[PDB]
Structure formats: structure tokens, C-alpha cells
Design a protein around this ligand. Sequence first.
Ligand SMILES: OC[C@H]1O[C@@H](O[C@H]2[C@H](O)[C@H](O)[C@H](O[C@H]3[C@H](O)[C@H](O)[C@H](O[C@H]4[C@H](O)[C@H](O)[C@H](O[C@H]5[C@H](O)[C@H](O)[C@H](O)O[C@@H]5CO)O[C@@H]4CO)O[C@@H]3CO)O[C@@H]2CO)[C@@H](O)[C@@H](O)[C@@H]1O
Ligand SMILES: [Zn+2]
Ligand SMILES: [Zn+2]
Ligand SMILES: [Zn+2]
Ligand SMILES: [Zn+2]
Ligand SMILES: [Zn+2]
Ligand SMILES: [Zn+2]
Ligand SMILES: [Zn+2]
Ligand SMILES: [Zn+2]
Ligand SMILES: [Zn+2]
Ligand SMILES: [Zn+2]
Ligand SMILES: [Zn+2]
Ligand SMILES: [Zn+2]
Ligand SMILES: [Zn+2]
Ligand SMILES: [Zn+2]
Ligand SMILES: [Zn+2]
Ligand SMILES: [Zn+2]
Length: 427
Amino acid sequence: GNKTGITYPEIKLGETGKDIKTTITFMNNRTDMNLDTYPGKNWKSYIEDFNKMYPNITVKVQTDSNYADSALTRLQANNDSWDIMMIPAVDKSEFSNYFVPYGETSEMEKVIKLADEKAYDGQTYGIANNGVTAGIVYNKKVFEEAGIKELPKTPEEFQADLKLIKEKTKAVPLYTNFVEDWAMGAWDQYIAGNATGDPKFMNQVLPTTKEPFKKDASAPDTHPYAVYKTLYDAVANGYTEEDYSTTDWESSKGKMNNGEIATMVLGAWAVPQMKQAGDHPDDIGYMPFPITVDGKQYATIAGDYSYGINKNISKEKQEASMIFVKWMTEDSGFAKNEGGIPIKADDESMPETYETFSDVELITDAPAKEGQEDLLANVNSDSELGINNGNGKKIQDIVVDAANRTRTIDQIMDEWNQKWAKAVEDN
Ligand SMILES: OC[C@H]1O[C@@H](O[C@H]2[C@H](O)[C@H](O)[C@H](O[C@H]3[C@H](O)[C@H](O)[C@H](O[C@H]4[C@H](O)[C@H](O)[C@H](O[C@H]5[C@H](O)[C@H](O)[C@H](O)O[C@@H]5CO)O[C@@H]4CO)O[C@@H]3CO)O[C@@H]2CO)[C@@H](O)[C@@H](O)[C@@H]1O
Ligand SMILES: [Zn+2]
Ligand SMILES: [Zn+2]
Ligand SMILES: [Zn+2]
Ligand SMILES: [Zn+2]
Ligand SMILES: [Zn+2]
Ligand SMILES: [Zn+2]
Ligand SMILES: [Zn+2]
Ligand SMILES: [Zn+2]
Ligand SMILES: [Zn+2]
Ligand SMILES: [Zn+2]
Ligand SMILES: [Zn+2]
Ligand SMILES: [Zn+2]
Ligand SMILES: [Zn+2]
Ligand SMILES: [Zn+2]
Ligand SMILES: [Zn+2]
Ligand SMILES: [Zn+2]
């Protein structure tokens, strides 16, 4: 339900909704930005700048840790207790049950990037706050200490580099952040465009493939197998932290900035947070995930968290919400400040944390075929795997089985393949 009769492309900032006085509530996952100590530009600061062209629109910001679970709970209460949230892991088909359509994708495609990401039946329901790549954060000082001269481009190269970090430095070669279910489920984001160079892989190939997690016999250093085995080998070889069950995310940022951690597998949004986390921001870099496909590396551009607007609020509140979202996207500088690509479609400016991406082919997952937009979500749900769905529990299990030598990676992938295989057949 779009109760405002105006779409995002039609909003002209400064002279749409200038009459409005209301209070909107913004839920998001950036707890760090909801504090005055935040090293960068925090939420209060963005809003103050917003209230300089919409001084009558008050923005209250709520943030929760374990945001993935808290936003999903609120969403299912299906009330008007929130105006904007970052969209949690809901099937693309339910969007209309909870969110205002910003406009039709073909029209949104003229004013924002990734317009078809949070889209269903031709309407865009979410706008990425930032465009991010799936890569690895790395401490250049730790890499230098170990004598690493070329960034690793293959899983074998990466393991050999981790070994050198373990042997020659005091750093954790790869810090798992096991305790954060979202940091573990982050590994699902690398198995498609990065592992295959195939934009159709995530939404077409993967849900029509019965055993997608098996080793690729032709290109064994590629495809989902190679990604999950990277994490498995790093742990089983003893190149991750002493005790995965004691990892702490906030202090991991400080440790990494101080050179106590060499690498963390996290999207490009993590680069600024690592930089700001101590002195030595210039020790923090970002590298493509170490998979090469036919002699070229690939990195998918996808949205960070996408702004969704509560279908249940009044017309004035939807208007104010959409204005704020458009301001965040077009005026705030949030994307640039948080290390990412602006979603505004009159701007590209590949942020600075990307020189090591000079020869990487950046890609965006293609949409499913017509009538198959649901297919990946159906297989996912039937398989109980939760690929790219915050089911970080299956990733934690990789860590636990590698560390306790309970199963091989091929046994793990085999189990997953059998759950997946039945789900694909069933759809
Ligand atoms: O399902 C397949 C589907 O994949 C698509 O993929 C998207 C997916 O739908 C989501 O949009 C997802 O969004 C992830 C973001 O890209 C990003 O990685 C995000 O990272 C969060 C992180 O989860 C966590 O909340 C973290 O919180 C921190 C915070 O940053 C700060 O440090 C604070 O101090 O601590 C808190 C922790 O308490 O913040 C990160 C930054 O926002 O995680 C999102 C997932 O939860 O991205 C997927 C991959 O693109 C489409 O491609 C589609 O085609 C396909 O069908
Ligand atoms: Zn005027
Ligand atoms: Zn109005
Ligand atoms: Zn659902
Ligand atoms: Zn449809
Ligand atoms: Zn339909
Ligand atoms: Zn140097
Ligand atoms: Zn090397
Ligand atoms: Zn947990
Ligand atoms: Zn193959
Ligand atoms: Zn190889
Ligand atoms: Zn293949
Ligand atoms: Zn200092
Ligand atoms: Zn330094
Ligand atoms: Zn080849
Ligand atoms: Zn369709
Ligand atoms: Zn199992």
C-alpha cells in the first residue's frame, strides 16, 4: 500500500513535504552509530543535517544488537510502531505485505542503483543504504611483517599466506567472529558471483542445481565448495583464533587495527569501522576474496541494509519516511562515509578502499527468470539451509567440526547437498 500517491522519483528534496510536521521512528542495525562516542558521523549528526531542510520532521532512531532477529520480530507484529526499518531476511514475495512501494523498478532504475534487489512483481520495496562488495579486510602491516608481496588470488595461495602470518607474526591470521551469527553467515555472500563469475548463479543456477556444494572437478579452486573450504582449512590448519567461542566483534575491530588480526571475511562496509577503531587506519586495506575464475577475479556489488517503509503508517508518516530515505540516499553522504558505493544513480565514485580491485570484474546478481523470483527462497526454505539468509548456524558448525576434527569439509558439503537436492527436486 502506497498511501501517499507520490513515488520516490517524484520527490524533490526541499519542496516535497516541506509542510509536514511529524515524528518517524527509524530502526536499524548500526548500534555503534546510535552513540555519541561513535568515531565517525553518527545518527544524531545525520538527522541534525536532515532537520536543516526538514526541521519539522523528527527522526527517533532505535537500534538493536541481533538486529536480524529483532527486526523480523517487530515486522511480524504487523503494527505501526515503526516507520522505517532496514529490511530483514523476508522472502521477496512478502514485501508487499509489509512495505510501501517506492515506485516501479523501471522508474526506480533511473534514480538509484540496485533498484531490482528489494523488488517484487515490478515494484521496488527497499533502497540500499550503501553499495558494498564481498571481499576480505586485511591489515597491511601484518602482511608486510610476514613478507607477503602479492595478495592471494587462490585458496591455496591464501592458506599459504595465512601460514606465513601464523609462523612469522603474533597476529590471528583469520579471525572468525564465530560468536556473531551474522558474521558467520556472511560467508554465504561469496559463493556465487565471487566464486563463479556468474551473475545468474545466485538466482538461477543455484536453486536449479541439486548438489551445488560439491567440489567442482574442472575448476576446484572455484564455486561454493572453494569458499566454505577456505574457512574450513583456515580453522583446521590452526590459522584462526585460540577459542572461537570467545570471539567479540567490537573488540575485533580494535584488535585488527592494532595488527592483532591479519584478516576478517566481511563486506566492504567493515573497512571504515576497522580504520576508525584505533590508530593506524592506514594499516587497514581491503582485498578481493582469493578465488580466481578462468584467470580473473570477481566481486559482487550488493546492497548493505535496505531502507523499508512501514505500509501501516499514515500518509503523512509514509511521506516523511520516503523524504528521509531519499535524503539519506541523495544528500547524506552515508554511502561514501561508510566505505561504500553511493546508491544515487547520478554518482559512481568508487570509494578509496578499492585500489586492490583494479583488475576485479565487479558484477551484480541477475534476477531470477520470470516466475522464479520465489524459487531460491522456496529451495532455501525446503532445504533448511538458509543460504544468504542469516543462517549463520551452519557456518558455525563448519568452524566447530574443523576445530574438533569431527568431519571433513567434503562430509559437511555432502550433508548440505542432500538437504538441498531434495528441496530442488521438490521445486
Ligand atoms: O538471499 C539471497 C539474496 O541475496 C541478496 O543478498 C543480500 C541480502 O538479501 C541482504 O540484503 C544482505 O545484506 C547484508 C549486507 O550486505 C551486510 O553484509 C550486512 O552487514 C551488517 C551485519 O549483518 C551486521 O548487522 C553489522 O552490525 C554491526 C554494525 O555494523 C556495527 O559494527 C555495530 O557496532 O555492530 C553491529 C553488530 O551488532 O552491520 C553490518 C553492516 O550493515 O548484513 C546484511 C545481512 O544481514 O546482503 C545480501 C548479500 O548481498 C541479493 O543479492 C539477492 O539477489 C539474493 O536473492
Ligand atoms: Zn518553496
Ligand atoms: Zn505531504
Ligand atoms: Zn516469510
Ligand atoms: Zn511474481
Ligand atoms: Zn506472483
Ligand atoms: Zn606499507
Ligand atoms: Zn602469497
Ligand atoms: Zn549466536
Ligand atoms: Zn564447473
Ligand atoms: Zn589451485
Ligand atoms: Zn559451475
Ligand atoms: Zn593516535
Ligand atoms: Zn600502523
Ligand atoms: Zn579456463
Ligand atoms: Zn515475475
Ligand atoms: Zn547437519
